[PDB]
């Protein structure tokens, strides 16, 4: 639980302030379109990187959170951080 979240936070701590805000906006849009699991908007807006990663794991799920974050990284035109996230997931996510 904590083991994967640690790597995820380290993935989201390379993001600049404006990049961080854009990531939050994209995540908010995705969540609003989603009805399976709802995430409050004020909590998203008030959260920092560590809180963001922990909550993203808490609501979505380890593998699903990694996949969503990789997809958004690709959307922002961030390739290299996406590859780093994929490899660190390969090395952090337990076999299932």
């Amino acid at each position: 639980l904590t083991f994967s979240s640690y790597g995820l936070q380290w993935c989201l701590y390379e993001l600049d302030k404006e990049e961080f805000q854009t990531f939050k906006e994209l995540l908010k849009k995705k969540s609003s379109e989603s009805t399976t699991c709802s995430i409050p908007q004020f909590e998203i807006e008030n959260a920092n990187v560590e809180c963001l990663a922990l909550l993203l794991h808490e609501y979505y799920g380890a593998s699903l959170a990694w996949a969503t974050s990789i997809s958004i990284f690709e959307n922002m035109n961030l390739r290299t951080l996406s590859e780093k996230a994929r490899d660190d997931m390969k090395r952090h996510s337990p076999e299932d």
Binding site: K17, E18, Q21, E45, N48
Partner: protein, 417 residues
Amino acid sequence: RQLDLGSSILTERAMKTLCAKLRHPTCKIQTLMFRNAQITPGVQHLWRIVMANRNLRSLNLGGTHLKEEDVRMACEALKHPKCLLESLRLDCCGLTHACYLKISQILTTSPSLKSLSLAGNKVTDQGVMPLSDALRVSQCALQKLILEDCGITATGCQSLASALVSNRSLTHLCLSNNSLGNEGVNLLCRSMRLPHCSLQRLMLNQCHLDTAGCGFLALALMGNSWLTHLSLSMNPVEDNGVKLLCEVMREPSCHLQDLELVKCHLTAACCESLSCVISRSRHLKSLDLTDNALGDGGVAALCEGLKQKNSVLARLGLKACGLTSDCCEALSLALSCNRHLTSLNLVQNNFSPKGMMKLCSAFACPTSNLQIIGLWKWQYPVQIRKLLEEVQLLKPRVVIDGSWHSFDEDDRYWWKN
């Protein structure tokens, strides 16, 4: 005087404690800055000090998030009769329509505030109309205004045109990165053709202009003597548009002093026209031509222009224009002849060692007095470095730094932002 936070994660208690020690009247700090910091939880605490302290002069925010209650508090704090704040800067705060309404009301009511900036906000024409209505009244005491990435349209342009014809107080206006187009250019030009307009500096960058917009601006430029600065950068204004502007500016009645244009797809013909303008005109004091394939012919034309003794050109800007040896020889000769040119710039070019020898020899002449030169020393062999150091020894006032914008006045870049 000045305090700044290059970066920080402030807690609400931290900002409360910092503000507590700034409400004291003994404080003497003029400026502030919070653009890069993260201070969102405690932003509300920032207004009490501006309401209370009397010596505060400037205030800069940015990247933060503001709610409606916060903007109402800002309005009330500005509404105190005792405040003397003379500048504000909001950025990317993501305001709402009611926020623009409140801001317009305080602008018309507050006499101290003489500036305002809204860059990165989503201010649609519905956010332009209330501001124009506030501007129409004769009490408004605004003198500067910045609107970046607002994404206004033609309707905003005509609203601003009506406000400007009605208004008689505003001086600086910047509308950059907006998709106005020829129609908006034409509307503003029509509003500006009157002899009672009192605008002194306007810049329109990335506005999707074309030849037609340049024609409209040139047409409205004739019969005016107040506007003194202009800048149309990063628009596909071809040779023909520059030709029209040169035809308008060739007259003795024009009072245009500074003109900058970057990335405009220029060539040698515009250079011939501009050499004519430089040789003849008597009020142009600056110029910029970057990322333009001016080439040897263009530089030769500008050299034939600056060879004249009448010219009063102060600073010139060349960069990434693709130069060579012969053009550098010609430029060196011209710099030997000229006596008014002070600043200069040459980077992102390919000079041969013979050419660099020529340039240093020209800089050596007693006649020329260049107080700034733009070059990279370390980019050359040791022979060239010691030659340039020798030149630096004579005329100890000369400054050879590759990074331009050194010794440039503060206003030119503080106004724009």
